[PDB]
Amino acid sequence: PHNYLAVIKVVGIGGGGVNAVNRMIEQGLKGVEFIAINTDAQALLMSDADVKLDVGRDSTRGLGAGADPEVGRKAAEDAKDEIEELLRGADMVLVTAGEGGGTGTGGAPVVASIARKLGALTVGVVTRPFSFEGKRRSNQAENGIAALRESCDTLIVIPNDRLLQMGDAAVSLMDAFRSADEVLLNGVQGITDLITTPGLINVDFADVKGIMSGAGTALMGIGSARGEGRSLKAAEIAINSPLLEASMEGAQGVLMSIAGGSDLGLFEINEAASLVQDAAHPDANIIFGTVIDDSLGDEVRVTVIAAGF
Ligand SMILES: Nc1nc2c(ncn2[C@@H]2O[C@H](COP(=O)(O)OP(=O)(O)OP(=O)(O)O)[C@@H](O)[C@H]2O)c(=O)[nH]1
């Protein structure tokens, strides 16, 4: 095998998607070309993405979609040519969005469908809305997730409800949607940083493509720790993450990443790798990799993507 660089693109769509891509920029996600997409023209113009694109100006005059998914879709199908060339020749496209709105919910299945005809491995990373946003938002989101899982290879759904504790005690509204911005970041960063920033144990691109092709919907767990025993306290928190909905024991596909400085020893790596093979189904397919980040200092971060129940 000669050397090969995987070209990876991360497209946020809708306000929620673009706000999260903004958080990826600020925290320095790399190896990836960012792409913001919205109908709100005002919201696009402070996206810090390398590529922006408004959809169906005639349809909206640049106002949004008014919480109506079926026009959020039509705006994207009539930018299909602009999208298909923004993504020409990618090996992996990740679609981010908060689900429940109009453009994200409606547009995301279209982006993902385009990336999958282009032969790219297409992974969706989305949130379920908070319960306090009403039932119409929850119904519309559940219709977008159904639409999108049929246009993806893997769809990671994150329940915002379980961020609320697992967060702070006295959270605020602004804080809550900030938390959801970092979770989406943890979702795509958990995946891409295996390809683009491998550590001691490096997974190739085609191992990721193997477990994640046709995987259906998936969930995620995160955890972090410092000190001695850091690697398996973090891996413990990841297996028991509210975000994972205790779905670990019965998952047939699992992609795990452990992130740490170059100070990360083989022994730490091995105990965390063992604790997740133990907590997984015995017939489960597990692919696992180390990630190098000298900026976390003492902290170790574990991330678990579980698919196919
Ligand atoms: N991660 C993240 N999610 C958000 C944010 N704001 C809202 N959301 C979630 O995303 C869902 C809908 O996404 P929005 O961006 O608000 O709606 P949209 O996709 O832009 O569609 P429009 O309503 O037509 O603008 C909401 O129900 C929230 O649960 C945010 O700032 N960050």
Residue numbers in the entry: 4 to 312
Excerpt from the paper describing this PDB structure:
To address the nature and in vivo role of FtsZ lateral interactions, we solved the structure of Mycobacterium tuberculosis FtsZ (MtbFtsZ) in a double-stranded protofilament state. We have now identified candidates for these interfaces in a new hexagonal crystal of MtbFtsZ, which has been determined to an Rfree factor of 27.3% at a resolution of 2.7 Å. Compared with our earlier MtbFtsZ structure, our newly determined MtbFtsZ structure is similarly double-stranded and reveals curved filaments in an antiparallel arrangement. However, in this new structure, the inter-protofilament interface is located at the external faces of helices H3, H4, and H5 in the N-terminal subdomain (lateral interface 2). By contrast, the lateral interface in the new MtbFtsZ structure is composed of basic residues Arg76, Lys77, Lys83, Arg119, and Lys120 and acidic residues Glu80, Glu87, and Glu153 from both interacting subunits, burying a larger surface area of ~870 Å2. These residues form charged complementary surfaces, suggesting the existence of electrostatic interactions. The charged residues involved in both lateral interfaces are generally conserved, indicating that they are functionally relevant. Comparison of this structure with that of MtbFtsZ in a different double-stranded protofilament state that we previously determined revealed two different inter-protofilament lateral interfaces. By contrast, when probing with the streptavidin conjugate, only single bands at both the monomer and the dimer positions (corresponding to the higher molecular weight band in the anti-FtsZ immunoblot) were detected. These photocrosslinking results clearly demonstrate that both lateral interfaces mediate interactions between FtsZ subunits in living cells. Mutagenesis of Lys121 revealed similar variability, with K121M and K121V able to complement. These results, together with those from double mutagenesis, suggest that lateral interactions are predominantly mediated by van der Waals interactions, which are sensitive to surface geometry; the charge complementarity may enhance these associations.
Bacterial cytokinesis is initiated by the formation of a ring-like structure termed the Z-ring, a polymeric assembly of the essential tubulin homolog FtsZ at future division sites. Once formed, the Z-ring serves as a scaffold to recruit other cell division proteins that collectively constitute the divisome. FtsZ subunits have been suggested to interact through two putative sets of interfaces, longitudinal interfaces that join the subunits in a head-to-tail manner thereby forming a protofilament, and lateral interfaces that occur between protofilaments. However, unlike tubulin, which exhibits strong lateral interactions to form multi-stranded microtubules, FtsZ polymerizes into single-stranded protofilaments, and undergoes GTP hydrolysis-driven treadmilling.
